[PDB]
Structure formats: structure tokens, C-alpha cells
Amino acid sequence: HKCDITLQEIIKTLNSLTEQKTLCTELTVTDIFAASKNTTEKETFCRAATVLRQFYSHHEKDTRCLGATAQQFHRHKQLIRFLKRLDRNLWGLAGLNSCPVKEANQSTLENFLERLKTIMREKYSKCSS
């Protein structure tokens, strides 16, 4: 088939977070990247999407980087908010919605945005069979 608008749309948001990472990246999140066997991209989107989902909802109120500066706090609610925009949409761009596991390992949110964007660049630059 051909590239879809859903992805060209997501890379726009996923990109704004990288150019602007006021969410104090390097905070630690579920490491959904400990399987270099090359899992289907849609699969990394299913698990990966699961972590961004728990991250923006729980961080909303958890004195975790909330932003001692009432000003920085605005950035705290706005970034998580944009994260969730990515959690609900990422489920459509992924394709699956049932990847329950338990990655005891651990990674860094900064790496989740880097790793997560690494896959999207692959599916977006290859939306044709």
C-alpha cells in the first residue's frame, strides 16, 4: 500500500517531544527494548505504547519532576498530556492491543523516545511492501 496520514501525523508529535524534552527525560521507564530478535514494529508499538500510557497518567501527580517552579509545572502537565495523545493514537498506528509481559529490566524515558522514534522512522520510510 502507501504511507498513511496517521503516521506522518504522529512523527510530528513524537518529534516535538524530542526537539522539546521539557519532561526531564532520563527518568526511567519500562525497558521494552531487551529483545534484539527484531520484534514486529507494530509489536514494539503495542508494549511501548503501554508504558507511555502509564507514564503520563501516573506522573501527572507524583511529585516526580512535577516542577518545583510553578512555571516548569506547566511544562509538566503539557508534556505528559502530549504523551497521552501519543498513547491513545499509538494504539491505532500499532495495530495490536494485548502484549502483557513483565520486563523486569529497566530503561530511561530518554531512550524510550529515541528507541520509539527509531522504529517509526523504519515503518514510515517503508510503508510500502
UniProtKB/Swiss-Prot annotation:
Name the domain of life this protein comes from: Eukaryota
> Hey, which family's this protein in?
Belongs to the IL-4/IL-13 family.
**Residue window of the full protein shown:** 25 to 153 of 153
Q: Which UniProt keywords apply?
A: B-cell activation, Cytokine, Disulfide bond, Glycoprotein, Growth factor, Secreted, Signal
For molecular function, the Gene Ontology terms on record are: cytokine activity; growth factor activity; interleukin-4 receptor binding
Linked disorder reads: Ischemic stroke: A stroke is an acute neurologic event leading to death of neural tissue of the brain and resulting in loss of motor, sensory and/or cognitive function. Ischemic strokes, resulting from vascular occlusion, is considered to be a highly complex disease consisting of a group of heterogeneous disorders with multiple genetic and environmental risk factors.
Question: What's the protein called, per UniProt?
Answer: Interleukin-4
Q: How does it assemble?
A: Interacts with IL4R. Interacts with IL13RA1.
Is Coiled coil among this UniProt entry's keywords?
no
- Which organism was this protein described from? Homo sapiens (Human)
Give the gene symbol. Answer: IL4
